[PDB]
Amino acid sequence: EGVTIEFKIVGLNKKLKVFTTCPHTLFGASFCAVAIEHPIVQDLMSKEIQDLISSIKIQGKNNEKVGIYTGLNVKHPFLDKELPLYVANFVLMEYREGAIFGCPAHDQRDFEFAQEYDLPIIPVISSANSIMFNSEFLNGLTVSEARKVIVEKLEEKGIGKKTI
Ligand SMILES: NC[C@H]1O[B@@-]2(O[C@@H]3[C@H](O2)[C@@H](COP(=O)(O)O)O[C@H]3n2cnc3c(N)ncnc32)c2c(OCCC(=O)Nc3nccs3)ccc(Br)c21
């Protein structure tokens, strides 16, 4: 069920690989997040943002789930839309890609993060398998059908591959 997705970094000839078990919820994407130790920090981020990540313990005042805006955005693969890229304290560096997409409507972790930083919350699975909405070509498909179609579309565009 898992898929590795390549997000294009806006303004750069560079890609970020993220992994999701829930690729059918991609139209609910509000952000992407990498671990503190992700090499994209040293490769692409400003001295000031690198300095912050190396000097400061990332811990929340109000909420435990917190992050640092990287100064980088990612292009949504199916919408004419940019997503902010964060370093977040709840992403494991050594687990899969050390990088996630945020779906606050359907992931309780992403939800708390999105609330903390006023990031968009976009519902895409109707409460009942359940029906997709706010999801363009996935609209009206069951979660099962949508999982199949989204992976086909990602593979067709060469931006996603099935990953066990
Ligand atoms: N967030 C949006 C969407 O993407 B999912 O979020 C990603 C990914 O699919 C999933 C990993 O899949 P897997 O268990 O290895 O098959 O966990 C998050 N993740 C992947 N790399 C990660 C990493 N370095 N550090 C922390 N977290 C990671 C995800 C959900 O996941 C549930 C399972 C989970 O939580 N599995 C976990 N595995 C290890 C820590 S959490 C649930 C709902 C939704 Br809508 C989603």
Residue numbers in the entry: 222 to 349, 359 to 394
Paper passage:
Here, we report the discovery of potent boron-based compounds that inhibit an unprecedented target of Wolbachia, leucyl-tRNA synthetase (LeuRS), and demonstrate that inhibition of this microbiota target is an efficient approach to arrest the growth of its host. The editing site of LeuRS plays a key role to maintain fidelity in protein translation by hydrolyzing tRNALeu mischarged to noncognate amino acids such as norvaline. Altogether, these experiments show that benzoxaborole inhibitors of Wolbachia LeuRS are prodrugs that, in an enzyme-independent manner, form adducts with adenosine substrates. The adducts then bind with potent nanomolar affinity into the Wolbachia LeuRS editing site and efficiently compete with the physiological substrate norvaline.
(A) Overall structure of the Wolbachia LeuRS complex with the adduct AMP-Cmpd6 bound into the editing site. In the absence of AMP, Cmpd6 and Cmpd9 did not bind to Wolbachia LeuRS; however, in the presence of AMP, the compounds were potent LeuRS inhibitors, with dissociation constants of 44 and 6 nM, respectively. The potent nanomolar affinities of the two compounds are explained by a combination of multiple polar and hydrophobic interactions established by the inhibition adducts in the editing site. Both compounds make equivalent interactions with Wolbachia LeuRS, except for minor differences in the 2-amido-thiazole and amino-methyl phenyl groups of Cmpd6 and Cmpd9, respectively. In Cmpd6, the 2-amido-thiazole group enables multiple polar contacts to the side chains of R330 and Y316, the latter further being stabilized by interactions of the adenosine-phosphate with Y316 and R317 and an intramolecular interaction within Cmpd6 established by the sulfur atom with the neighboring carbonyl. Furthermore, the oxygen at position 7 hydrogen bonds to the side chain of R330. The amido-thiazole group also packs against the adenosine ring; however, the π-π stacking is not entirely parallel compared to the phenyl of Cmpd9. Other key interactions, shared by the two compounds, are a hydrogen bond by the oxaborole oxygen-1 to T241; and the three hydrogen bonds established by the 3-aminomethyl to F322, D328, and D331. In the adduct formed with AMP, the phenyl and amido-thiazole groups stack against the adenosine base and enable multiple interactions within the Wolbachia LeuRS drug pocket.
